[PDB]
Symmetry: D3
Subunit: 151 residues, 6 copies
Amino acid sequence: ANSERTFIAIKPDGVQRGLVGEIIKRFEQKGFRLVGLKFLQASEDLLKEHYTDLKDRPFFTGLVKYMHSGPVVAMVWEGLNVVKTGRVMLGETNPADSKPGTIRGDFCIQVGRNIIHGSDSVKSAEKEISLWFQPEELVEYKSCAQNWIYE
Amino acid sequence: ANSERTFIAIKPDGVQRGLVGEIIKRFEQKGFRLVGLKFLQASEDLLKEHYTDLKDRPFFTGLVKYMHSGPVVAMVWEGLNVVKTGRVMLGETNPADSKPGTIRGDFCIQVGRNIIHGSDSVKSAEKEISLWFQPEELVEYKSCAQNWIYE
Amino acid sequence: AMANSERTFIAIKPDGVQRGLVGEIIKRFEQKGFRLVGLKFLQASEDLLKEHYTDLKDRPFFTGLVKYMHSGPVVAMVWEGLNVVKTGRVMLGETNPADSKPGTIRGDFCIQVGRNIIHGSDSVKSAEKEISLWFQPEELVEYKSCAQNWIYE
Amino acid sequence: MANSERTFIAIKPDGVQRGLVGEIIKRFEQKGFRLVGLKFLQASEDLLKEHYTDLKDRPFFTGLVKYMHSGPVVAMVWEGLNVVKTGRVMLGETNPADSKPGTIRGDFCIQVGRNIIHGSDSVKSAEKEISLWFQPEELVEYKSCAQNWIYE
Amino acid sequence: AMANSERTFIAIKPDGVQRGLVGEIIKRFEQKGFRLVGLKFLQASEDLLKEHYTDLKDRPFFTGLVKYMHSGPVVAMVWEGLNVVKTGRVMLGETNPADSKPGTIRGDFCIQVGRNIIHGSDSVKSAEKEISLWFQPEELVEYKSCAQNWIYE
Amino acid sequence: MANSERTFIAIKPDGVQRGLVGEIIKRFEQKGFRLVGLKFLQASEDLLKEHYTDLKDRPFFTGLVKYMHSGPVVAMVWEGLNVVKTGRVMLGETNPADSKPGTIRGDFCIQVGRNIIHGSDSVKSAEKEISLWFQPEELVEYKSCAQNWIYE
Ligand SMILES: CC(C)(COP(=O)(O)OP(=O)(O)OC[C@H]1O[C@@H](n2cnc3c(N)ncnc32)[C@H](O)[C@@H]1OP(=O)(O)O)[C@@H](O)C(=O)NCCC(=O)NCCS
Ligand SMILES: CC(C)(COP(=O)(O)OP(=O)(O)OC[C@H]1O[C@@H](n2cnc3c(N)ncnc32)[C@H](O)[C@@H]1OP(=O)(O)O)[C@@H](O)C(=O)NCCC(=O)NCCS
Ligand SMILES: CC(C)(COP(=O)(O)OP(=O)(O)OC[C@H]1O[C@@H](n2cnc3c(N)ncnc32)[C@H](O)[C@@H]1OP(=O)(O)O)[C@@H](O)C(=O)NCCC(=O)NCCS
């Protein structure tokens, strides 16, 4: 319950525009803990399975080639309702709909360059975590401030 | 008209997690003027009178003992709608409903660990102010910017 | 593309300069993805403010608004980007800071309606009128931003 | 006994009026030191004169007392290893024109007569100043959750 | 007085503008306690820069410096206060960003010397030469900060 | 060339538990350096030994390996002109008491036994450690879009 995990990935425009540290900071100060972290240049084959739900969409080719044109920061975060609250912290998928104070609302403009991706559901979280991370690369530890975050 | 006061308290999980300065900062940059500030470990008796409207709730015992298990920072802020807008700045009482940009929305997760308390009304404010503070501990002064914060 | 070149006029009111919010104000517009086209430091005359606020000359606060806008220096800015008029309003917040949400410029830094530190063009033609009013075409600097291909698709 | 040394930190009236209170506490909190005492107060010229008793012969003594009395102060007591020494380093030089960027004074003030913050110059100056503004009641003892990550 | 009003000329270079460091630089001078007197956004010409760097015409990097300062728009600013020429130079950092200390402007956002984001008047005399060069007397705004009596005794 | 030099920067277990990861990365990003390698790992007691092989004859070597092993670390590789030397300056002195405000250790830690972050002391140390924590596959080469504004 207090160990739910979600997949968060900083897109190539986030790395290029230098927003990797700020994004990691909003999740740290919130109270979530990092379980996995890697710096990687994804293959278009990997992205196709990650975006297999959108293969019918007209933007699919441009989305896969944009996600491949640069490195990404693949993370795994853990905490009570990390999937949902993470989506709230991220904002709406279109930055034009995001409210200020959200990651997209403070840092990006266009839908095709929305700097960050969050797992839309627990089922989408477990599918994406097992896709980008192996079980070895996920680190298990207890934050020194757990008893001050949860009861 | 601009002299209304509210009671703001940083809960024991807000002191332990190093969130005291940032919390005071949001009320300083907002345009509010600090009137009372103290550092205190509230006795269970001082808390039960503060939470007397919640004595019939099942969590009342765990709420008092958690608020007593650590020191709190008790503050009094004055300004136009410092009670109401203070509730807005704090956000919703359960952090899972709070919006990003609010204090709880940026820094905490669970309801029982929401780092901060605010007065819910002008009637709650007066009672809470007169309960934790004596009339002398309250400092009355004029901010050098009040002609730029108010007209 | 030609839509990504949309422009808006953002002014930092005298209370925003006095309370030292100019750099933080420009920071939210820089970190968002928008580009600086014009920037000047000015003391607007009452005559200049009246034409800028001509659609409020019937309101009772008009005289108090113009003199307060003239009682100090302002920071006139022009910004460009996709929906810079509409999203700038969002980042600014609601005109009354008691309505603004935390995270907005007005929600985070100001209290009273008469001292809401910042102005934003409400529409594209209000932006078109306000940019041509405070800026001459010479004062506007068009440059390609080094991260443009990472802001846009 | 060194992971318990306390120092007295005071935010001057100009530090409050300009709204640097949370910013000052933030640097002490993130540094690793623990907040032991806190109070908001408009100092009387009596306690000021005992606080600055070492400067009674200096020409600025009168203007310093009435300035520190012209507004409210935030009186703080911080605990940690060498909090008296590294507290002075964090503060910067007493003349803000001598403070280095990154310090509280080097970042936030200009003139020496308005240097927003005061630091205890020594452990003996601290315990005198601690006993001056703070009674042993108003000092809170507790263990921070990250102490074992701050100390060995 | 006169000392409580000395002016310097701090310029944000094109790499500071391109990398989104305009708001951060203004915020540091604001929170220091200095008074914004003038501010302009400008693509300065090769000729304006030659006179600005006239004491460096006999240096091999002089031609690549003027073309880099012309390759983008700059933020020209004027700040007023006590010892703001000197203190501003300490805030900027050392001109070689590898010598600038952390906490300075160049120590925090700069690596190479040919890309040192910002310039500061080295002396009061260089200030009054540079200020009169980039700005006209009209564009300089004199006003009284609301916190002056808490910055100066 | 010298715009491509790399260094090895690790965030110790106390830097992670006290939530400093995003801040440490942000200071390197805003400086202008490029992120080359990034991983999150619980280093084994065999890995930090060869990392701290020069300190095996120091009395603290035992408590340092097991402290480095007591939590997860964030191993990083950064590339830029003089990133090894300028990395050390940004970190500050190894003894946080000697670190200057504005550095990572002058802002965020107190004790030598808990200085949150590590930096490569030299180019040859950097290349020895980069090949110790990272394999050539995990290092991502990409041209930062603002390169022509960071370097001339
Ligand atoms: C919406 C509702 C259903 C739930 O919201 P709620 O969190 O329980 O109610 P509140 O937000 O007003 O709680 C206020 C305080 O109680 C605490 N609290 C509330 N629920 C808590 C819980 N489940 N566990 C621990 N603390 C809780 C909160 O920490 C909060 O702290 P605060 O001083 O900072 O404000 C609420 O309206 C409700 O409970 N109504 C019925 C209350 C009632 O009938 N009381 C009579 C006796 S049962
Ligand atoms: C919202 C509206 C309907 C009137 O509501 P309102 O309470 O006046 O709030 P507004 O949105 O008009 O605020 C406009 C400005 O008037 C000023 N203002 C508003 N209320 C004020 C008050 N009580 N005292 C002083 N100034 C006030 C503010 O400065 C405000 O923000 P700005 O300076 O950044 O522009 C207004 O949009 C309106 O009058 N529309 C009709 C004509 C028009 O303005 N059209 C817009 C162009 S399409
Ligand atoms: C390491 C050495 C330089 C002296 O150490 P120093 O003066 O304290 O400063 P340094 O930064 O250079 O190295 C100190 C290391 O020892 C650790 N250390 C020192 N004292 C410690 C203590 N009491 N407890 C825990 N760790 C300690 C430090 O944590 C640091 O490791 P870190 O980077 O993770 O923080 C010395 O032992 C030496 O000569 N080493 C040779 C290795 C080298 O640098 N070769 C370069 C060839 S070009």
